[model samples]
Target: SDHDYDVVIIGGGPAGSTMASYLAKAGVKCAVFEKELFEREHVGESLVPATTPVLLEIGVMEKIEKANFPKKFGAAWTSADSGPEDKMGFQGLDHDFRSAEILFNERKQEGVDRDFTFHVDRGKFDRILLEHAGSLGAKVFQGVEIADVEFLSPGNVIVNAKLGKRSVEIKAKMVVDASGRNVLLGRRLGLREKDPVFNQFAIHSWFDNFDRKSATQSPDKVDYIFIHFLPMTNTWVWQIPITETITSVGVVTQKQNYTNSDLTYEEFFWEAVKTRENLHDALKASEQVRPFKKEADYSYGMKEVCGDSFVLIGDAARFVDPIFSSGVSVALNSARIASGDIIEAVKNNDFSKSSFTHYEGMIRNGIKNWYEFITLYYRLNILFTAFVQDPRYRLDILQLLQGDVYSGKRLEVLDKMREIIAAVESDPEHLWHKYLG
Candidate 1:
């Protein structure tokens, strides 16, 4: 069977769904094709303050609140010497502009009924987003896998898919490749390029009876973010509380570190968790709710996000480390920008590379900021050793930890922090001698 749409979006995740919702709201004829049924288990559940505006702009903020997401105040980080007592936290409260409860709030607050970030079940969230788009008049096709796609001309393209046992084809004036890491169209067109810095695999699992410090504060509270640094392999673990009873736990590590030993990924993960002085106490009493799963080092991007008739968004375009939890924010922002650009392109009847400059610019800036931020954070030891010891330096470092890096208004602060880190790296004696002394 053959059908047509003005815009064809692949992968109904945040990027595709956000784009479809915006385009559909603007009276654009759009459709989203998702291979997975809604709410499929996926990783990357954390959200940052930068994503709040985009969620509100896309009309999902209300739905998010109604879903009863847990509220997050900020992130807590710990190392060997860094126990919960010595732990450093990035309280959204430090940023005068954003709200910890509203933007990062997972649970509904009294009187105030909105939330910023959520540890969502991917299947449920994906389904909701697709339904939202459909409510706005965008066509959605689920459980149908795209088999092939061809750009018929600058103004037209054909997508072939297998819908259950039947073959179907879709024609469109433009296409949005929001297929996450699958990069369906990107791989087909040979535009995917992996990032050299992040060739690592991630092992993850969901757990019940997972002891978290945040749970001690409120019955329904969800601690937005927690990062634990392991001693032996330098592996980092993230524990995100998704609901009152369920928590998401995962470890991000270099692929070279995985050894064929007696220990499985789950064992290794639990071992690392138990051995980490910072987290052992909390986890020792906790129980694993489900089997551990693994996702390979899959971060990559498209060489050309846009072509004569298509553009890519979200993981389809690029994905770096999930350390800073910028996935949802980047996808939402990209979708918003892409919608505007596509509308303008369609209006001018031009689908060339030039028409996508705005969308490309937005995505590049967002991704670049996140990439740099995560890079610096992971390299904290080399840069933060002195700050970790000195109260004054620690205060300054804390400000950066509180999501200060993204504020273009605070570039000077970031520059100074970088300079300090650089100086510490170059002359450890001069810069960090005081710490040892």
Candidate 2:
């Protein structure tokens, strides 16, 4: 009947760390196991404005602010053949994003500047969060890999891990699978499913002296995340400022497109760049600051994220396309949402499938909302642009882009876009038919 900790969390990334922070702050004796050490190179450097409040709540925003990671104001999408007239300009495109104050409160809250979010060095950003969780009394074990987990009964579980040459077993009241893409519990329990829709592949690297504005042609919005559209279908390049002199750039396309090509990885990347003249120009003077990395088949869903004595958070539960920079926002928010139920369960000494029902429903609902929005964008790229350019629908689109999707706002715009998609697909003479790929 001896227990090592109240909660044993696998993986020490943002999800684990954020969960630990909340649980430890509330006196839920917890520990985090990280397979790898922190300050390591990682992808998903861009973050959305929604993540700021979580950072603030977890007590790490001040440290992140002082970390001097680049400040990101918004994002812009452009095509290779587009001219100034084709550009959506600053109004509709996430520039100076308004906070969720209006959307959540139905009225504006004054005196708060929530217009900007940060583009981070993930290595450093994650370390800050993990260490902050430790500061709040969460025990953190780095370089400790979780090998297997056992659920003995309701409110009782065990985690098997390897720390260097030693194998360790930690018993706890509950276990949280924050193991990100490893999906520890999801895989072991056969609950993970590969996304049937978006089989996206990406190759990315950090670059020095990358010309941001020249690539995006958005001169004044220097720090905005820029998505340069290619001539091919469902393909684009992302440019994000990680620091003043360092930029993170990547090319993303359907997995089949890369597999069908005769070119090598670098060749495929540069070729995608050449499809966009500005993107090519932007890279001409730049040198790779880090080795190019590949990410494929990154999208997935978990059939069951939480059950008796355990729960999954962040990427372990679900992940959609990264086109919107929604990963971190979703991860941080999932932890925030799960912690409430977890804390309540810990106090009540009850860890049952029913105990986490709300967490399961809300997290699944949130990602499903994100999935729908993403599908709408890929369904008809121009349709999203059409909505953004339209005065009546601009705010709705902007709210989704700003990552306020968890509130279950009646995203009526998405339904309209779906109807438009239906019409575009059904009628050959539709005005939007030419934009369909």
Candidate 3:
């Protein structure tokens, strides 16, 4: 069958739009399909400094800056054990890998400060990225649902998408799946699988008039606070200040522990919120700006994300918990890598899994490290608590938090973290074990 384009991408999200941007920049023909209009209300609002490099590479850094997203200096955490009086802060600024020079260099030619991370509005952010992709010559179709996909002759695939009363069939040499948790193609192929360790759910909502306090003596240095609610129970709360008057509050809970009740999402959210003294106090003066939202059944991986003529990117490939807010970063990074691989594969007419495995390896390594780190952080609270409290352990933890270890350049730092964790685990008498255990 004659193809509509070189690549037909399903989902015009960060992952799809990013893949489209890079591929189109490389002069590869591509089109993206999105079921919803742009700037739709989605969760996952925080972006770590780790994503900065990839955004710069894909040419969206300027758009991000122009959006005036709030600056996130670092992260702060509070716990029941520590009490409201004993708060601790984890400084992203202190990491050796976090360089002001690199950040500034990326923005210098554009003439901007490169000191902080972004607190993005998913709606605007996605639209800007998709627009950039379109500017680069990639086609973006909104309000389009991909109903069926067929693999035709070698290196060819057909996608049937429905938009309103119209259905269109698009043929392509390859398909990139960025359909997020919908997992359009991944589900059809039965390639989607859940990570046993990451069986969790989350409830999120945005608010206005929420109170925020900066780290002491640093009035300009406010922190995004994350609190662990229960030890090893896979539950926690994230407090992000998107504006002086607006904040994003949410809780992630283990699926096994979640109870389906008659309560609405907002009720459950407020119920969970009131359970935390700190969060309740933070929201005392605030009002809910939107209805609460929930997402359960979080996990990772597909039996195979790539084959002879297609590849899966972002949430379609895998998505664990949002404890680290690595979702967008991983999606954008994977899109960049996959675009390069697709360019090479298309030019050489080699769509074999063996040839595509290079991109697969990169995606696996990056996600695996992030998954392991998040798992350990949530499961081993005592170790994480101790590490967070002591500045000495901050370097390694910060390195991992900033997404520095994903480049495969910091094996020694990860190794050191493992050693510390093992030592603490072996010694029940260790101060941290006694405190956390």
The all-Cα superposition gives candidate 1 an RMSD in Å to the true structure of 5.8
lDDT of 3 at 258: 56
- The window of 10 residues in a row where model 2 has the poorest summed lDDT is 96-105
TM-score-wise, the better of 2 and 3 is: 2
Error of 1 at 261 (Å): 5.9
lDDT of 3 by residue, 1-437 (tens): 36789998889988999999998888888999999987798887887776777678778888878988777766655545442112233332232211111121222212223556787788888999999999889998998988878887557788888978788888888889988898987789889887876677888888787666511234554545444354335567777766667878887776555575456666766666676665676675678898778888768678898887789998999888887777887888788788889998778877767768888888888877887788777645534554544456555566656665445664454565577667767887654454332
Clashing pairs for model 3 are: 39-123
* Best by the TM-score measure: 2
Candidate 1 lDDT over 404-435, as tens digits, reads 23323433444655775576567765533222
Candidates, ranked, TM-score: 2, 3, 1
Off by over 4 Å in 3: 83-113, 214-218, 223-232, 260-265, 389-392, 413-431, 434-437
* Native-to-model Cα distance after best TM-score fit, residue 170 in candidate 2, in Å: 0.3
lDDT of 2 by residue, 108-191 (tens): 222224667889999999999999999999999998999889989999998889977788888999999988787899989899
For each candidate in turn, the TM-score is 0.83, 0.92, 0.86
Q: What range of 10 consecutive residues in model 3 has the weakest lDDT sum?
A: 96-105
In terms of lDDT, the best-performing candidate is 2
lDDT of each: 0.67, 0.81, 0.72
